[PDB]
Amino acid sequence: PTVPDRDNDGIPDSLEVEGYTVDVKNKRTFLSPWISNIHEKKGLTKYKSSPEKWSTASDPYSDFEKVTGRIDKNVSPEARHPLVAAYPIVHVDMENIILSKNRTISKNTSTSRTHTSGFSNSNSSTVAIDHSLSLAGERTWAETMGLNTADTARLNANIRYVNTGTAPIYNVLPTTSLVLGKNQTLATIKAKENQLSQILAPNNYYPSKNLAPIALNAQDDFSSTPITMNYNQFLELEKTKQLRLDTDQVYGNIATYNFENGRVRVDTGSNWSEVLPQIQETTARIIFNGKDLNLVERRIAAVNPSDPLETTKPDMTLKEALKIAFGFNEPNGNLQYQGKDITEFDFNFDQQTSQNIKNQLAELNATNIYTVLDKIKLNAKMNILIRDKRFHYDRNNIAVGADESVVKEAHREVINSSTEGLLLNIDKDIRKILSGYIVEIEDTEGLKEVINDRYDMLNISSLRQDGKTFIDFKKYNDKLPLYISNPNYKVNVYAVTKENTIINPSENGDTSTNGIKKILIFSKKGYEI
Amino acid sequence: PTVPDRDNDGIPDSLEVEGYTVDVKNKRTFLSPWISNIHEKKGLTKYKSSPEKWSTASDPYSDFEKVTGRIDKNVSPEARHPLVAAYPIVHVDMENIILSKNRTISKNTSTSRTHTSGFSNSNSSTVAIDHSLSLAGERTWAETMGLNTADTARLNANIRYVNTGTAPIYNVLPTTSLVLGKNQTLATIKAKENQLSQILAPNNYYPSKNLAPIALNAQDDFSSTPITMNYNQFLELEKTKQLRLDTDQVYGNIATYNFENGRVRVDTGSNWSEVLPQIQETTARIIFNGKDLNLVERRIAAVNPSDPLETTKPDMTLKEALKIAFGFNEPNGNLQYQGKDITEFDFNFDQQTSQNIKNQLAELNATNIYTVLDKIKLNAKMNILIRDKRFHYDRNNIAVGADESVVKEAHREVINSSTEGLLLNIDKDIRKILSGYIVEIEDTEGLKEVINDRYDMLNISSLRQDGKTFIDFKKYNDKLPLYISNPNYKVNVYAVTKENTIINPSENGDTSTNGIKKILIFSKKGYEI
Amino acid sequence: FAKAFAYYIEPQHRDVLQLYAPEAFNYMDKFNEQEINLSLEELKDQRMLARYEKWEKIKQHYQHWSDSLSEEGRGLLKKLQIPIEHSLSQEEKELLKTEEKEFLLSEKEKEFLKKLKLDIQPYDINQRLQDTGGNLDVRKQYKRDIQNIDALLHQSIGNKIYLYENMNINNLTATLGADLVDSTDNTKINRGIFNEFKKNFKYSISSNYMIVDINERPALDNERLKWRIQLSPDTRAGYLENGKLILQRNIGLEIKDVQIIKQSEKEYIRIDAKVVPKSKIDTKIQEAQLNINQEWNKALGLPKYTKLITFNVHNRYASNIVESAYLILNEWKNNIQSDLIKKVTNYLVDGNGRFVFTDITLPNIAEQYTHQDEIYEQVHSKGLYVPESRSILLHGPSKGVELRNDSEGFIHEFGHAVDDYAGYLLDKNQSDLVTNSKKFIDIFKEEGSNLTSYGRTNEAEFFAEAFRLMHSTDHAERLKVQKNAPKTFQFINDQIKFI
């Protein structure tokens, strides 16, 4: 009188194939078969799983443990569903650098998680250094640091680690190598030993935001100036202002759940560098930038016709994936992410998937995938990139621009205006595609006076502690308020999108903002202030 | 015919959900279902727990062992209740420093465990350096130490460890790094190896108060002066006079109870650095400064709607939580802490918590939380700060001041007064937010003579061995008794609160107490002395 | 209903069912366990061919012994099935010059009717065996006929055959039978009284020879009870030519369930019973008797070992009476002065009295006749305090002609016993109630007849009745005696004071 349980995973067969859900009564949890009408009012999710896989995902967590919660309580909520691999995704975030020669340029930097194209399962990022001149007198880096053709500069940066995955790493910390340009490997960050004794929970930093970021140079005797850098490299760096941070997957050990007493102990037998390949070859990979215009990656288990055992997994339709991987729902049967309908997004596919994907729309005789969306079967190894269609993108699929019309529409709310600047309250996302502003005044007869007439003097817009952006004129002015020769003279304000910015002096070293493509954003007369 | 026991924790399920209690008969201990009439007279606590958790709290001690006493007899009483995680909380207390250059400025220090706001699960403290001039002639440290622009000072401090948590650490001791300013990390204190074979019980010091504190500098040959420090830091230090002590979470192993022979053996398999993350994600954190105006941290297990297994734990109402965590009782049905009513306390909430709690107050149709206290459900991950409503506070949530009016009543009890000083008896707690006293004399015609008219001369009050505060006039006088130009001349006494104190000479190096906000305390004619 | 059935069958879904509807799971559990065979038997009873075939088959078994049956046997069964309903010539005719009145003074002439009532009773067996629980000349006939009829049926019943029998509710409890049918709708029965009937109805006993029908047939108007019985292979029963059976005496039956069903637009009452050995249930009876005694022996200081209580009930309604003793006893204490209980019990523990609860006629129950001076002097009723035997008799089967419930019936008998105890304290060697005779007779002249007609009978009944009203649980009854007999109240208050 024992229900057949082939996979030996606690859950009985029939439940696994057809659908079940756990529900708690009084205070005891028992596993129950899905009742369509009586479970829905309670807001429980309808599960599916493999009767022949101790872990449908193939991750180190059993089908049963996941839904009941006997599991490292740190795994993010969205990864509790049996069809979402729970694993870590660590990339490196570099906060700021400083330079000198083996008169020190100490500049703050900004980094973004990257993804490029024939794209492979390996994490990499790319830092971009700000070009605006914080100091007036620092024209020509070559001279601010007494760098000569036969000199060598020393680099001193700060980095922090970011966990954007869904599972914790415990002991080890990843090795990571810096490389400039196509092939110039500047340095490989040593793997400090037995020192990352802290935890990387999803959406957390190491070390946390409350502590100093890890100083890169050891300050010991390992190398006198580990970050040497020949002249030619410095030249390359000055023209490009872009670096990349490649990291491998040598993560730590795994945290397993022990039934006997509920203690979570790190087992020394199971190691992440052997499990990831399995997940990585038997799941469909979806990268999504819906949340905050940052690349969030999830992996879903899809069937592969060619392999017997694999047909055991429940068929997975795309629409549910989006429902279960990110949080989309159907208040009125219309797919949306906090209001924004599904139709505002692009679909791009790698060359392999495309032939396969063209087929499925043919046996359905449809041309708009957005309608018949709920009838597309997912296969193993597809890679899908879903990004908002409204913004322009660069080669590395980073948000870099947008159509001006949306941009203008984004600016129609002037909370306050004076002769010292604007205090706007704009949606946090736009301010990730704006490098700075050029202010100019227009004589009633067509003249044009650009205040900050230097390539590196546009970053004049700060943000107040109430989320109000504040534009200061006296910043790249002469510490003087704004004068107006005529209450009839027009005051023009332009915005410059990232894609259209200049990072270095031109052929003849032009520094004026003349030949810069500028979008008009504001124009109020002298008396309209 | 066996009573069910899913959690395998000795106590049966039904017993765990509905209510039980431990009792002693002749001399044997037995478990009983809560009987309303026979247990209250015995002063027994009504326990509840999770039928599905080997340790409802999730800490390394089972539900059964806690109430039964089979547990490290060192766990503090308040942590014996099944719903309060017993775990360690280590912070560093630095007792006094001395300085010189690689004629030694030796000052006593005072430290307070700190907490600021987006506050995270990471321990940090704050030391405050004494400003009073022990030597008359020791004006300007920059000269008391022959410090030159191209010199270097050596730092050698004394420290002791403080355990304010609820469970013992056994073998290891945490590494901790010194940092000046925002990012100037002066030093990281090494983790001495195989030397902390002693124990750190709650509310104890290491090494105990009866022994010399651990000398910071090694005194060996490892580094001649590991803590070097260029000139500019000293300047920074002179302007700020504040340091920071960040501590990590690397504790030792855990002490477990062995059933076979009742021996408590240190298991080399279980390690605290794996449990805290579990605890930190499933508990509500409560900070209370009631006892002695010091930051006490406790953790309570609260429900998280999103997790089935977690819903198993008994619902926790705020009112009861405070009852079991700190010692509040119900003498007359009014919540109080040894007399002080709950209404004299503040409630502060994190923005996250605010949303949940503001909702919670809406479905109850109440505006004063102090009334509906027994109707607030606690959810997981809330952070609550209960502070005395009577005092002023600074940015790092340290007690720093109070309304002056309250201050006066604290002095209305003159036990004795003479021409050599005052012998007061003030509540031990007030005297940590008072920096000093301003004494002044008033001519019969309205003049004003301030005796210690220097910023660094206000430490004129002592405490006698009978807990009587004693003010000494001859200290910062001319080693002369107190003279009075008129038995009709009024003697004025002012008090100076910490927040309003000056720590460095002013713009024009003013040392007079002119621009200091001073509160009048004790005034008496010449014959009333 | 259908949905519940489905959920019950599926093993994996079985647990879910029990979780959300516990009582419902219990309901379906009892149906599939032992309540599905009953569905099949009842369905076959509508098909004429089936019932006829079943009847024919059973006959074709017992036929051989029917030919063997002797004439004497048939003669006994005849007078058994049908009750049989110039000898004085002396002074009785001169003096003479409801059913017993039609068929057929406060002096020595009413005694001749008591004797004649015993001599004029029909010669019957089934009521006598049930009435007695198992003139002298007739007794010899009874003994021989009962012995002869007993030594007839050697054929044990030894698949399960179900039989039907219609019985008058007045045979179990005539007090409830008067209001069982809704006053405003004679086709419906009030559930409120019904749940009470089922309350303590767990098992029943048949002491006589049941005459039952093989196939269900329409019942008489006053018969709404359709007994069905699960026979035992060892039970001996005797078939008749008119499609009836005579069951062995001293049969035990366990009641598993009692519910209301509908048939031909009218409601009726179904009692499901199973044949079991009577000895097996009697063993259960002694344990129940011990439990009530042990509990009450420690109650009023009584010695633990003394029984003071014997369950002598033997009837079709025995088990509700048994469980009702706890209710009656609990009420008796909660309703009487604690100090009165202690006093009366000391007067009983000192002797060898008993509280006899029975469902047989008083002169044949246990000792009543042993304290009677003449056979014709026998008295049968719910009960009366007997000084000679110092025993309290409570006839469960009967319905008090005056009291509204059992509590009132007991308290009414409690008065006679109280008078005897008072007499013991006062005149040790003289009539316990000789002091109350001239004391109450005078009180009975001025206003004795004013009260209930039961108390008007004599001083003893009046005293016993007055005590009950003065100690009733309904303050209204107690108040009544105050404003209707202010004089009587003071002296009545004074005898109970006597400790």
PDB file of N, CA and C in Angstrom, chain A residues 128-153:
ATOM      1  N   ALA A 128      32.962  52.211 -17.583  1.00  0.00           N
ATOM      2  CA  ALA A 128      33.149  53.395 -18.411  1.00  0.00           C
ATOM      3  C   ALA A 128      33.500  54.575 -17.525  1.00  0.00           C
ATOM      4  N   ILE A 129      34.613  55.195 -17.803  1.00  0.00           N
ATOM      5  CA  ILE A 129      35.083  56.303 -16.992  1.00  0.00           C
ATOM      6  C   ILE A 129      34.480  57.604 -17.492  1.00  0.00           C
ATOM      7  N   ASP A 130      33.990  58.415 -16.557  1.00  0.00           N
ATOM      8  CA  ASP A 130      33.453  59.735 -16.865  1.00  0.00           C
ATOM      9  C   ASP A 130      34.521  60.640 -17.451  1.00  0.00           C
ATOM     10  N   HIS A 131      34.127  61.390 -18.460  1.00  0.00           N
ATOM     11  CA  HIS A 131      35.021  62.296 -19.144  1.00  0.00           C
ATOM     12  C   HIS A 131      34.950  63.737 -18.658  1.00  0.00           C
ATOM     13  N   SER A 132      33.888  64.140 -17.960  1.00  0.00           N
ATOM     14  CA  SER A 132      33.769  65.539 -17.551  1.00  0.00           C
ATOM     15  C   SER A 132      34.901  65.945 -16.610  1.00  0.00           C
ATOM     16  N   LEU A 133      35.302  67.217 -16.693  1.00  0.00           N
ATOM     17  CA  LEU A 133      36.430  67.729 -15.910  1.00  0.00           C
ATOM     18  C   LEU A 133      35.964  68.175 -14.530  1.00  0.00           C
ATOM     19  N   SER A 134      36.217  67.346 -13.519  1.00  0.00           N
ATOM     20  CA  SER A 134      35.947  67.765 -12.149  1.00  0.00           C
ATOM     21  C   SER A 134      36.825  68.947 -11.742  1.00  0.00           C
ATOM     22  N   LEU A 135      38.098  68.925 -12.133  1.00  0.00           N
ATOM     23  CA  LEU A 135      39.024  70.027 -11.904  1.00  0.00           C
ATOM     24  C   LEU A 135      39.250  70.849 -13.162  1.00  0.00           C
ATOM     25  N   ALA A 136      39.261  72.169 -12.987  1.00  0.00           N
ATOM     26  CA  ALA A 136      39.503  73.081 -14.098  1.00  0.00           C
ATOM     27  C   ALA A 136      40.855  72.834 -14.756  1.00  0.00           C
ATOM     28  N   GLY A 137      41.920  72.807 -13.963  1.00  0.00           N
ATOM     29  CA  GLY A 137      43.278  72.776 -14.460  1.00  0.00           C
ATOM     30  C   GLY A 137      43.816  71.478 -15.007  1.00  0.00           C
ATOM     31  N   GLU A 138      43.002  70.437 -15.144  1.00  0.00           N
ATOM     32  CA  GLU A 138      43.529  69.123 -15.496  1.00  0.00           C
ATOM     33  C   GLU A 138      43.438  68.823 -16.993  1.00  0.00           C
ATOM     34  N   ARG A 139      43.610  69.830 -17.849  1.00  0.00           N
ATOM     35  CA  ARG A 139      43.676  69.581 -19.287  1.00  0.00           C
ATOM     36  C   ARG A 139      44.897  68.744 -19.634  1.00  0.00           C
ATOM     37  N   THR A 140      44.690  67.715 -20.461  1.00  0.00           N
ATOM     38  CA  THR A 140      45.763  66.822 -20.891  1.00  0.00           C
ATOM     39  C   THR A 140      46.278  65.972 -19.745  1.00  0.00           C
ATOM     40  N   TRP A 141      45.816  64.727 -19.689  1.00  0.00           N
ATOM     41  CA  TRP A 141      46.239  63.842 -18.618  1.00  0.00           C
ATOM     42  C   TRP A 141      47.742  63.644 -18.667  1.00  0.00           C
ATOM     43  N   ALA A 142      48.293  63.518 -19.877  1.00  0.00           N
ATOM     44  CA  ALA A 142      49.716  63.255 -20.042  1.00  0.00           C
ATOM     45  C   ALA A 142      50.569  64.188 -19.205  1.00  0.00           C
ATOM     46  N   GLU A 143      50.054  65.371 -18.881  1.00  0.00           N
ATOM     47  CA  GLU A 143      50.825  66.338 -18.116  1.00  0.00           C
ATOM     48  C   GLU A 143      50.427  66.411 -16.649  1.00  0.00           C
ATOM     49  N   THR A 144      49.150  66.197 -16.312  1.00  0.00           N
ATOM     50  CA  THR A 144      48.765  66.183 -14.902  1.00  0.00           C
ATOM     51  C   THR A 144      49.559  65.152 -14.119  1.00  0.00           C
ATOM     52  N   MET A 145      49.936  64.067 -14.770  1.00  0.00           N
ATOM     53  CA  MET A 145      50.873  63.098 -14.236  1.00  0.00           C
ATOM     54  C   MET A 145      52.114  63.254 -15.092  1.00  0.00           C
ATOM     55  N   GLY A 146      53.255  63.505 -14.466  1.00  0.00           N
ATOM     56  CA  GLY A 146      54.442  63.703 -15.270  1.00  0.00           C
ATOM     57  C   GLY A 146      54.864  62.452 -16.004  1.00  0.00           C
ATOM     58  N   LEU A 147      54.034  62.029 -16.948  1.00  0.00           N
ATOM     59  CA  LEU A 147      54.288  60.805 -17.678  1.00  0.00           C
ATOM     60  C   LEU A 147      55.120  61.111 -18.910  1.00  0.00           C
ATOM     61  N   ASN A 148      56.235  60.412 -19.044  1.00  0.00           N
ATOM     62  CA  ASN A 148      57.124  60.540 -20.184  1.00  0.00           C
ATOM     63  C   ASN A 148      57.078  59.252 -20.988  1.00  0.00           C
ATOM     64  N   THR A 149      57.582  59.329 -22.220  1.00  0.00           N
ATOM     65  CA  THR A 149      57.583  58.166 -23.094  1.00  0.00           C
ATOM     66  C   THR A 149      58.183  56.945 -22.413  1.00  0.00           C
ATOM     67  N   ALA A 150      59.166  57.141 -21.537  1.00  0.00           N
ATOM     68  CA  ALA A 150      59.836  56.042 -20.855  1.00  0.00           C
ATOM     69  C   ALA A 150      59.457  55.972 -19.379  1.00  0.00           C
ATOM     70  N   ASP A 151      58.239  56.371 -19.048  1.00  0.00           N
ATOM     71  CA  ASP A 151      57.736  56.310 -17.688  1.00  0.00           C
ATOM     72  C   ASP A 151      56.754  55.153 -17.543  1.00  0.00           C
ATOM     73  N   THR A 152      56.291  54.935 -16.310  1.00  0.00           N
ATOM     74  CA  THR A 152      55.277  53.926 -16.030  1.00  0.00           C
ATOM     75  C   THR A 152      54.359  54.463 -14.946  1.00  0.00           C
ATOM     76  N   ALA A 153      53.064  54.327 -15.178  1.00  0.00           N
ATOM     77  CA  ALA A 153      52.033  54.780 -14.262  1.00  0.00           C
ATOM     78  C   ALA A 153      51.510  53.643 -13.397  1.00  0.00           C
TER      79      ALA A 153
END
